[PDB]
Design a protein around this nucleic acid. Structure first.
Length: 52
DNA sequence: TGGCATAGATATCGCACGTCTATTATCCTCAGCGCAATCAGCTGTGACTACCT
């Protein structure tokens, strides 16, 4: 479990008063969902998985 | 007598079927500007009268 870690978006990290370091690799590329993003993904499902 | 298949008995994990509160950028309102026919005051012009010759 100590090797299992929780993650947040860069915007959510900033909300948590955290700034991602330069060049940091994405620990998890996952589904992205925001108002404009959600509507765009509903427009076409091919990029719903491709957002990451 | 003894090796073990063959199904009775039983859970067991996977696929599928219900809710739930938010990994992140809206909807009306009042004050601030604008545009077009009167109306009035600044300025020009004529009528009346003062002054140098």
């Amino acid at each position: 479990r100590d090797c299992v870690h929780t993650l947040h978006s860069r915007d959510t990290w900033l909300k948590k008063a955290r700034v991602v370091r330069l060049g940091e690799v994405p620990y998890k590329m996952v589904k992205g969902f925001s108002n404009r993003a959600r509507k765009a993904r509903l427009a076409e499902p091919q990029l719903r998985e491709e957002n990451d």
